[PDB]
Amino acid sequence: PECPDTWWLCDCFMATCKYNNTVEIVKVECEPPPMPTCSNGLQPVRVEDPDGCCWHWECDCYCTGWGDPHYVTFDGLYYSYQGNCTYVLVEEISPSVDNFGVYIDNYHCDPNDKVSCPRTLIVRHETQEVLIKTVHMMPMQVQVQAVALPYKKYGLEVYQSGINYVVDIPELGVLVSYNGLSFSVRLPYHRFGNNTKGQCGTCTNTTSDDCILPSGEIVSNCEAAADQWLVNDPSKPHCPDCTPSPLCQLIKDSLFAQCHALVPPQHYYDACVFDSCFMPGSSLECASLQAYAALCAQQNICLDWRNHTHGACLVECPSHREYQACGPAEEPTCKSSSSQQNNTVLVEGCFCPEGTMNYAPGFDVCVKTCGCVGPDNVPREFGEHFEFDCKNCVCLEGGSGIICQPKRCSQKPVTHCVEDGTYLATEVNPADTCCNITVCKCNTS
Amino acid sequence: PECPDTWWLCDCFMATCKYNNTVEIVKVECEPPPMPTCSNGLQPVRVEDPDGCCWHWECDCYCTGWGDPHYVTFDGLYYSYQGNCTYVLVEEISPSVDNFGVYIDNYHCDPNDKVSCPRTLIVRHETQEVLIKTVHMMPMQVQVQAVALPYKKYGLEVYQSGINYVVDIPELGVLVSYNGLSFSVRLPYHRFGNNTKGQCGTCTNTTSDDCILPSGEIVSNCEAAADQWLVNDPSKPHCPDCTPSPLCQLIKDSLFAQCHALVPPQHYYDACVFDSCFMPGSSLECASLQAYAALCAQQNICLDWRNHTHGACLVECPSHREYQACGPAEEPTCKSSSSQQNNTVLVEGCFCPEGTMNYAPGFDVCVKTCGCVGPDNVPREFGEHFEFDCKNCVCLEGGSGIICQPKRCSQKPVTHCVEDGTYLATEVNPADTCCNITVCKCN
Ligand SMILES: *[C@@H]1O[C@H](CO)[C@@H](O[C@@H]2O[C@H](CO)[C@@H](O[C@@H]3O[C@H](CO[C@H]4O[C@H](CO)[C@@H](O)[C@H](O)[C@@H]4O)[C@@H](O)[C@H](O[C@H]4O[C@H](CO)[C@@H](O)[C@H](O)[C@@H]4O)[C@@H]3O)[C@H](O)[C@H]2NC(C)=O)[C@H](O)[C@H]1NC(C)=O
Ligand SMILES: *[C@@H]1O[C@H](CO)[C@@H](O[C@@H]2O[C@H](CO)[C@@H](O[C@@H]3O[C@H](CO[C@H]4O[C@H](CO)[C@@H](O)[C@H](O)[C@@H]4O)[C@@H](O)[C@H](O[C@H]4O[C@H](CO)[C@@H](O)[C@H](O)[C@@H]4O)[C@@H]3O)[C@H](O)[C@H]2NC(C)=O)[C@H](O)[C@H]1NC(C)=O
Ligand SMILES: *[C@@H]1O[C@H](CO)[C@@H](O)[C@H](O)[C@H]1NC(C)=O
Ligand SMILES: *[C@@H]1O[C@H](CO)[C@@H](O)[C@H](O)[C@H]1NC(C)=O
Ligand SMILES: *[C@@H]1O[C@H](CO)[C@@H](O)[C@H](O)[C@H]1NC(C)=O
Ligand SMILES: *[C@@H]1O[C@H](CO)[C@@H](O)[C@H](O)[C@H]1NC(C)=O
Ligand SMILES: *[C@@H]1O[C@H](CO)[C@@H](O)[C@H](O)[C@H]1NC(C)=O
Ligand SMILES: *[C@@H]1O[C@H](CO)[C@@H](O)[C@H](O)[C@H]1NC(C)=O
Ligand SMILES: *[C@@H]1O[C@H](CO)[C@@H](O)[C@H](O)[C@H]1NC(C)=O
Ligand SMILES: *[C@@H]1O[C@H](CO)[C@@H](O)[C@H](O)[C@H]1NC(C)=O
Ligand SMILES: [Ca+2]
Ligand SMILES: [Ca+2]
């Protein structure tokens, strides 16, 4: 009567077993209304229950830090802390993964404040460590050893999305984004809930306990708790009227009208004012604008704000790409055109013009026809015979864009050598530098 | 009481109803015995039912053709047809996929019967046609213009596996493998059941109805009906003693003992005898051994035949590749070593040595460790600086591993010069061919 295996059946049909061939079945179904607040103000995600029929809403853990001193913790709490040693951003209170740590090193690279090194982001996962450190205009990644942009190894991926260098762990769902002036840490609540620590605080959905010391007790003065998260290192062992600029008024302006809802602008406006007061006229005051716009874009609300700032800070990327305030997070590459489960959250950055498109990940030349591109960034077309390197090559469409078979030429000598000191001179041929000639040529002796 | 969907429940449960809660649960589960024998004699594959109740055994439609005249239909009927124009292997009686046809072309790649150029096949799927031709030891493919080996476009893929160049349609399940002396067409039964037509016959699991003329007909001489399928197009529009050598005896030898079961060897032995009789002393008899071994490997009994052929039929590829008779169909390749999961039945063919491995698809350099390889087929190491195409280049792991930056050649100019007739000379730098420093040569 009670079933031989009153028992939860497949497809959520818990059944009350009257008998083996007749039962008293019950449907299971659960619809929760969207979680009202998440305390960070970002929209909740529906995370499914272990039973497929039911589901729930959980808050994403989002930490953001812009400019030099400013940071918002996983639960929205905003605080300004300045320091020099590498400070830990997030770790795991009860270690699940082998090494998981996103660590910031602000000015530890250099005491002076410049794009040479505002800060460097170190994401350490298991055996790997990724060190994104902005050397002037372009950050370069050092992995344990420099690497390229679309890196992928041991479940850790690194890629450039818009103006943000993204280090992600799909198995953990961890997305870390580094910009010149801003850093973001996004963690699933289910995987890292009430299990995180550091300057980004504890993801518990209440702002009250988002300031835990390495010891683990919390404090009210959240700014002081941040210094206690120092990551000790052998180097630097000690590791010890303002005018409201009109630019700062852009936060409260009608441009960000859609942003004033679903995202609180008070913190960013205060950060802008404080940065303007820190020293005027150093173009550091428009870092808060960038992150306010980025968070608005995260809320599926894309804005163009930079042309409104009357200059004084724009993007610095080469001429073959144009700045777009609203664009795909993953630009459409010809080689890798695919589903890509587009988030369609439109990010800002600079992309290839409308007519052309990017060739492939890891490349930067924009092309019209898809073609093939060689180590030198030059568009080739399918079927084009050319002579790259010193070898004749073809650009067929297939597994390898360029066959590049070896050139068919050689040095040309003279056997007769009938003149005083006629010697085979291997002078480089102007048409083919490698295909030179070694003809017999009279020398003085 | 009437169930508000008496119903087939989830996970193939079933029920009838007395109340929606009070239901009369059933369960449907079963395991039919294997299809004992299919006309092809290949092991039938496990084809799932639309629901989750049970499954069944459906044999794959396998058509093989080796040598010049020899064919075996989708149902194990062997025949020998000689032709000079392009012919249709398999089409659809009722067209369900647009322009889907596999067409053979004999005596047009070259009129040649030996491995250098036996024939060409043209696989047409929708907007695409793949023309695999083989010129001497190297088969080349033309797609609509030539293409590379790991070609992929519009759901149609071409690669090479072992000695066989594979054109497949994963959506349709169609597989087509050309080696110079053989081809094989594999079609799933459910997708192409009694809908096929051509020289490969109808896939009905019965040999009897295999032979049809273009117009629906049943003629018992499959050989004679093969001529009727001729596809004519603007190309070539005018288109219309024997010593029993031991080499063929190798089929019946104890080497193929595992093959004599699960695979009938009568057809291949007769084909070898006939090929020897057509003209002896030309090694056209090693095509039947090759395909017998290929079929055995399909059925898991992989054997080496070439070694005991006493030097008659051997494979060829450059020195960096060694012949391993039972090796992976998908080569372990460093780029995309993702534990590529494929049928673990090992194919014959030549691979990189056990110490090294193939670098990436479309490449041929057997890298030891891993690295980048340039357009020039030179192995590179991670974090290595070289000078290629007159640009400083670094091989570093990531995307587009070779990152090459322009020369940046700082020629320092020798210009104030004193000697008889010393003129400023921007001669090409001996140290760097790319640099042409001013060195100020005299007369
Ligand atoms: C962590 O958890 C989640 C996010 O993960 C968040 O909590 C959920 O939402 C609220 C937080 O505000 C929790 O508490 C409830 O708040 C309601 C507020 O409603 C007021 O405002 C609306 C505006 O329209 C008015 O209409 C309304 O009249 C109120 O003025 C309260 O109304 C709720 O009270 C009811 O529910 C509780 C709990 O069942 C009952 O005890 C009450 O008697 C009454 O029926 C309630 O106080 C809510 O509980 C959380 N939901 C879930 C599913 O957990 C938070 O960010 C965070 N921390 C908290 C506080 O949980
Ligand atoms: C397509 O693929 C199918 C499945 O593999 C094959 O069709 C069957 O496969 C058998 C196996 O060879 C074929 O041969 C004969 O099967 C008879 C089955 O009869 C029993 O099973 C059926 C139900 O399936 C019952 O109704 C019946 O009462 C029996 O219990 C056998 O009886 C035959 O035996 C005779 O021939 C063999 C040699 O082949 C002798 O050794 C025996 O002594 C006896 O004389 C025989 O085995 C047959 O075509 C199909 N039968 C089945 C099992 O369904 C086809 O081979 C394949 N291609 C074709 C042509 O359809
Ligand atoms: C889990 O989170 C709650 C707050 O939501 C906290 O009070 C509790 O101590 C946490 N426990 C763990 C497992 O850390
Ligand atoms: C210039 O500014 C306007 C808003 O005032 C904006 O709509 C436009 O896209 C900007 N163009 C640029 C970026 O030059
Ligand atoms: C993303 O957009 C592309 C077109 O740009 C489309 O082909 C692809 O299917 C989309 N993927 C998803 C699921 O967003
Ligand atoms: C300059 O260098 C190129 C490349 O090596 C060579 O072909 C050419 O002859 C040299 N001379 C000049 C000045 O053109
Ligand atoms: C050209 O000169 C090089 C040396 O720079 C020599 O190795 C080569 O054999 C010569 N012949 C060719 C290829 O023209
Ligand atoms: C296939 O065979 C079935 C009978 O099993 C028949 O009804 C159907 O019409 C046949 N289809 C073709 C086109 O051969
Ligand atoms: C190699 O050849 C000899 C003669 O063919 C034979 O005895 C031996 O079994 C062969 N070994 C294999 C299978 O490689
Ligand atoms: C394809 O099959 C081979 C044969 O064992 C097996 O190694 C693996 O499944 C595939 N090869 C690789 C490593 O890609
Ligand atoms: Ca918290
Ligand atoms: Ca048939």
Numbering used by the authors:
A (entry chain B): 4350 to 4354, 4375 to 4513, 4518 to 4613, 4637 to 4841
B (entry chain A): 4350 to 4354, 4375 to 4513, 4518 to 4613, 4637 to 4839
Which sentences from the paper describe this structure?
The MUC2 mucin polymer is the main building unit of the intestinal mucus layers separating intestinal microbiota from the host epithelium. The MUC2 mucin is a large glycoprotein with a C-terminal domain similar to the MUC5AC and MUC5B mucins and the von Willebrand factor (VWF). The C-terminal part of MUC2 is made up by a VWD assembly, a series of VWC-domains and a C-terminal CK. A low-resolution image of the MUC2-C closely related MUC5B C-terminal has been published, but currently no high-resolution information is available for the mucins or VWF. Here, we present a model of the C-terminal part of MUC2 (MUC2-C) revealed by combining Cryo-EM and AlphaFold modeling which show an elongated dimer held together by covalent disulfide bonds in both ends.
To obtain further understanding, we expressed the MUC2-C in the presence of kifunensine to obtain N-glycans of the high-mannose type. Treatment with EndoH resulted in MUC2-C with only a single GlcNAc at the N-glycan sites. When this less glycosylated MUC2-C was analyzed by Cryo-EM (deglycosylated), it was only possible to resolve the VWC1 domain suggesting that the N-glycans restrain the flexibility of the MUC2-C tail. Alternatively, the less defined tail of the deglycosylated MUC2-C could be caused by its lower mass and increased difficulties in image analysis. The N-glycans were of di- to tetra-antennary type with a tendency for having the larger N-glycans found on the VWCN and VWD4 domains and the less complex ones on the MUC2-C tail.
